[PDB]
């Protein structure tokens, strides 16, 4: 799962 934020991160900076 924390790994997985791994991938969430990309989206951090999608909508900005």
């Given at each position: 799962f924390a790994a997985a934020x791994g991938l969430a991160a990309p989206q951090x900076?999608?909508?900005?």
């Amino acid at each position: 799962f924390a790994a997985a934020x791994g991938l969430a991160a990309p989206q951090x900076p999608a909508p900005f």
